[PDB]
Amino acid sequence: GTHSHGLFKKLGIPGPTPLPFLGNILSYHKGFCMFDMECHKKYGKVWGFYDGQQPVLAITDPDMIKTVLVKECYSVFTNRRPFGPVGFMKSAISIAEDEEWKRLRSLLSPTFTSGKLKEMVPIIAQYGDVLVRNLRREAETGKPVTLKDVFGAYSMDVITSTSFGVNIDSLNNPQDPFVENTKKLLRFDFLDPFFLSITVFPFLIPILEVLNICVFPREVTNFLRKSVKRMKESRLEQKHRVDFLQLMIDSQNSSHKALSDLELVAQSIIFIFAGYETTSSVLSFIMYELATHPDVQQKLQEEIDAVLPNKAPPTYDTVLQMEYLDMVVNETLRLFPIAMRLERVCKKDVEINGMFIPKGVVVMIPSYALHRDPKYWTEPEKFLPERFSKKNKDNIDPYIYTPFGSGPRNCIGMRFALMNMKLALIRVLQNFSFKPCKETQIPLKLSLGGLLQPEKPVVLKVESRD
Amino acid sequence: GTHSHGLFKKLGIPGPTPLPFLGNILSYHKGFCMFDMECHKKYGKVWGFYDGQQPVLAITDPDMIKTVLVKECYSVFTNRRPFGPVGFMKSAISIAEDEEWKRLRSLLSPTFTSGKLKEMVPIIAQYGDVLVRNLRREAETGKPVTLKDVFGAYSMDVITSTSFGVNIDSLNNPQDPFVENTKKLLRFDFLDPFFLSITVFPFLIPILEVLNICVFPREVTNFLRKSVKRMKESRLEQKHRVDFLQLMIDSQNSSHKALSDLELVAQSIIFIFAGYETTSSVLSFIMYELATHPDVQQKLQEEIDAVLPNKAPPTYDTVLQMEYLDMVVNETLRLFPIAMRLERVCKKDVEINGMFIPKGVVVMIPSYALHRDPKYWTEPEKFLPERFSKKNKDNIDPYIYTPFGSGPRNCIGMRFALMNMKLALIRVLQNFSFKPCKETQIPLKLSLGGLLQPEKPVVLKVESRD
Ligand code: HEM
Ligand code: HEM
Ligand SMILES: CC(C)(C(=O)c1cccnc1)c1cccnc1
Ligand SMILES: CC(C)(C(=O)c1cccnc1)c1cccnc1
Questions:
Q1: B292 half-sphere exposure, CB direction, 13 A CA radius
Q2: What are phi and psi of A464, to 5 degrees?
Q3: Closest residue CA from atom 9 of ligand 3
Q4: Which residues take part in binding heme (chains A, B)?
């Protein structure tokens, strides 16, 4: 059971002492981040622990992080850690490995250029307006509002229209087929009973594969897989060139093997999976900060109105202008980096920056811990957007602050996500103010589980500026 | 169950139609070779079948074989197929993979040069003489003799002295610790109940790994592992530079990481495993041919006496002189290539000689089938050493005849095995003649199992030329 539990004392690396079979996992009872902050305090700049028998080497030196994330990414640190029986989703770009990942990343990169994002702004923006109508009635009847649902509704609407050109009011059609299935594509909690069992019985993943058991619900994937083959074959026979689905079909008509029909479906799914709950999550987090910091919220309302007088519609170019807006988004992602950790598997035996790392270790960068480290962040607990002001932004290490990771395997959806969220916040603050309620959790607490989500759902009062 | 059972009809490759879950394995009831000869007849030059869910692509074109075995060996076709829970023997060179194999092959290659083989001739040759004394009494009492045991005894004696400098008469000490354990290192029958179960439940290999269950008996490996660490640490404090163990310890004192103490032990074991039963097997096969072809046996006796008049001792240089001897050994290996198949896993998607081979297929070369194909071999069923005469040897394709495989991953022990066997045959035929018995199986039949061994053990009369 302790087959590899002696690796780190042989390399001279400090770490919590593992129990047989379980390794160190019992320390996840306070969750990944508190586990990581404490390891960082106690042991310093580098340390090791075991997810069961899997060695994991944490690193916090910005120079070493750059080597892993960008420098020898293609040679050594190309893939993330496996996490469960994925079925055909093995071909999704976030899951794919090595050379099929390089092929997939090269084939999907043009889809995320600012040119294609700029053509999608009018569609996203339309659901800014749907968000106001849905929120205008939730404020006109002064009931406290549950951000997650009003923002979930919004993220969903952006997802469906931006990926498949299906234009629905999900809040007012929670019965529609497309919103019924995507609502069940929730982020994975790697500390829940199932995924923890996997960590302690990783030898069970092939068994589950052979029974067609999949961490992606076997029925939503089927619905989308037929919906896509329905969309295509129909789409064939107009506007087009509007959504992701369309940009992907058109790349199947160009030195890399064009996406297969099934590779295509896999990417459509992973984009929905990445964007839906994450986007609503951060949007909830941003408003909680703006409600508990109404000076910040007001300074943002003023910047919105200066750029967009008369509740003028936001555009691509006006979004990129708004500097306080950018500052607020980044500072909310500092305190709540939805990822918590970045990881790569060490493909070979390598020495980086003076440290032998053996094959098969997963190297982990603990983003949440670095975003809250005193050694880089004055008053790290405080929501303080001025740290990203054009005056101070230059004294922040891009390898300490990595809300989207770094290097060739960074978030491919960063520009989109950033714009998507910004367009929401503008149209919302153009029409509304957000005040705390008796029911609001202040200060907010993070869950002890595996997702970076609030303990209790964020609820706030919302009054019409009108 | 039929997840991948449609791969070959998509590529247009012909093959027997697989059953769900089992693939094609029920056709192994007549064994690998008869399965392969029939596939070769029916489907031609290329075909596919499934060991359970594992696709296997057979190839018989000599040009394509060269690409796989030598040309793109390092890039694409570097590793053999996994076959069971191997524990620490994962570090043995025949099992090791990719870059650790390249390192291990480079670190062990000097150990098998003709210079080191030439220093080992006097030790091997000594057990030529032990073989005569043991056989002289088995013939002086005209009891039919069981080749496998008299040759097993011999192979064992060569193994122990050549690898560890332990000099025993195993036939006359079948109670000694070293002969008790190595006698249990028998070749694997991949058609036996266990290894067939593995093929149909390959998802069970990790499970067995985690229980420390190993196809290498957990106790013989331990005995040798302590024996080696005993040998060393003792060996330290004279002659030395005699056996494999010694050449390996000395390479631990030189751009490749010198063998670890455990890597070393693993290689000692695999050499014993490769050499012991195989050497006795072919030696049994050669004598069966010489008994059923006493003209051939006589022509060989005459060549031995011409080179070595007066029963003169064989030496390295005299062995390499003996051309009929070489011819007999090669022709016995044509009819009984102990390997049956050569295999490599296809690491990437590749096109070789006009054929797309997808990642993960194991490419198989069916040696037994090629050694008996009429299209290259006139009278292929007949034991006819003249096909390797200096007159006809040049019309034999080295990729059809591959008793040791070909390319950088060929048998590293070929020169040794060839000399080892030749030294046995000289001293034996110098003193003895081998005649059939009523009890001898004529014609010999091969087993329907997974090892290329005779149905019933070869038994023959042996008379002293003295
Ligand atoms: C607030 C919004 C988002 C955040 C903070 C975020 C963050 C991240 C992070 C931290 C990673 C790992 C980066 C690394 O390993 O170096 C990642 C990867 C990825 N993200 Fe996002 N993401 C967001 C939204 C999106 C959206 C809207 C998409 C839509 C397609 C998306 C698609 C992906 C993909 C496909 C990957 C894997 C890239 C690869 O392996 O090549 N993300 N993201
Ligand atoms: C009649 C005697 C022998 C025969 C016919 C034989 C045949 C073979 C064959 C057919 C292969 C596979 C080659 C390939 O995949 O291309 C092989 C590999 C190998 N043989 Fe032998 N062998 C014999 C004796 C020995 C002996 C005495 C040793 C002693 C060390 C040995 C060690 C090995 C090793 C280590 C490999 C794997 C090489 C690698 O993967 O780098 N063999 N042998
Ligand atoms: C799950 C997925 C696809 C992922 O690759 C991921 C997310 C955070 C950290 N590491 C990997 C993701 C999820 C949400 C936003 N972006 C990406
Ligand atoms: C089992 C082992 C080590 C092996 O690598 C092998 C043998 C025949 C075909 N393919 C691989 C072997 C066994 C006997 C002689 N040589 C090598």
A1: 18
A2: -80, 130
A3: A339
A4: 411
Bond prior to A443 in cis (omega within 30° of 0): yes
Report the distance separating Cα A247 and Cα A240, nearest Å: 9
Kindly give, in sequence order, each residue whose CB lies less than 8 Å from that of residue A311, ignoring residues fewer than 6 positions away. A430, A431
Residue corresponding to tokens 């480290």: A373
Going by DSSP bridges, is the β-strand pair B459-464/B432-435 parallel, antiparallel, or unpaired? antiparallel
Helices vs strands, H then E, count in chain A? 17, 9
Q: Which two tokens stand for residue B146?
A: 């069981």
Q: Which residue of B has its CA nearest to A52?
A: B210
DSSP assignments along B267-310, one per residue? HHHHHHHHHHHHHHHHHHHHHHHHHH-HHHHHHHHHHHHHHSTT
Quickly name the fold that domain A1-466 has: Cytochrome p450 (1.10.630)
C-alpha A463/C-alpha A343 separation (Å) is 42
- Confirm or deny that B411 is annotated as ligand binding: yes
DSSP annotation of A396 reads S
Distance, in Å, from the CA atom of B465 to the CA atom of B430, rounded to the nearest integer, reads: 8
Sign of the dihedral defined by the CA atoms of residues A148, A149, A151, A156, in that order: positive
Cβ neighbourhood burial of A169 (10 Å; 0-12, 13-18, 19+): middle
Is the distance from the beta carbon of residue A412 to the nearest atom of ligand 1 less than 6 Å? Answer: yes
Instruction: Round to whole Å and give the CA distance between A332 and A284.
Output: 10
Assess contact for B40 and B369: CB atoms under 8 A: yes
Residue with tokens 């042996």: B462
- CA–CA distance, A328 with A424 (Å, rounded to integer): 14
CB B460 within 8 A of CB B436: yes
Task: Please state, in angstroms and rounded to a whole number, the distance separating the CA atoms of residues B151 and A328.
Answer: 82
Q: How far apart, in whole angstroms, are the C-alpha atoms of residue A123 and residue A107?
A: 24
A83 neighbors A188 (Cβ within 8 angstroms): yes
The two tokens of residue A12 are: 């001279």
Out of B186, B333, B411, mutate this one to test ligand 4's pocket (max ligand atoms within 8 Å of CB): namely: B411
C-alpha span between B326 and B309 (Å, rounded): 19
Would you mind telling me the total number of residues written for chain A in this entry? 466
CB B371 within 8 A of CB B317: no
B-chain CB neighbours of A206 within 8 Å are: 202-203, 206
Q: Which residue matches tokens 């900060």?
A: A289
Instruction: Name the residue facing B206 among A99, A203, A210 (closest C-beta).
Output: A203
Give the β-pairing of B350-351 and A54-59: unpaired
**CA-closest candidate to residue B56, choices B3, B5, B1:** B5
Nearest residue, CB atoms, B99 vs list A202, A210, A348: A348
The alpha carbon of B415 and the centre of ligand 2 are apart by a number of angstroms equal to 10
Which of A262, A269, A242 minimizes the C-alpha distance to A100? A262
CA gap A16, A39 in Å, rounded: 8
Q: With CA atoms as reference, report the closest residue to B103 among A348, A180, A99.
A: A348
Closest CA to A371 of A334, A396, A332, A339: A334
Ligand 3: centre distance to CA A78 (Å): 15
Residue B99: list chain A partners with CB under 8 A.
Answer: 348
Query: What method was applied to determine this entry?
Result: X-ray
| DSSP run (H or E) holding B84 | none
A403 touches ligand 1 (CB under 6 Å): yes
Residue with CA closest to ligand 4 atom 12: B274
Which residues in chain B are contacts of A209 at CB distance < 8 A?
A: 203
- R_g over Cα of chain B: 23
Nearest-by-CA chain B residue for A348: B99
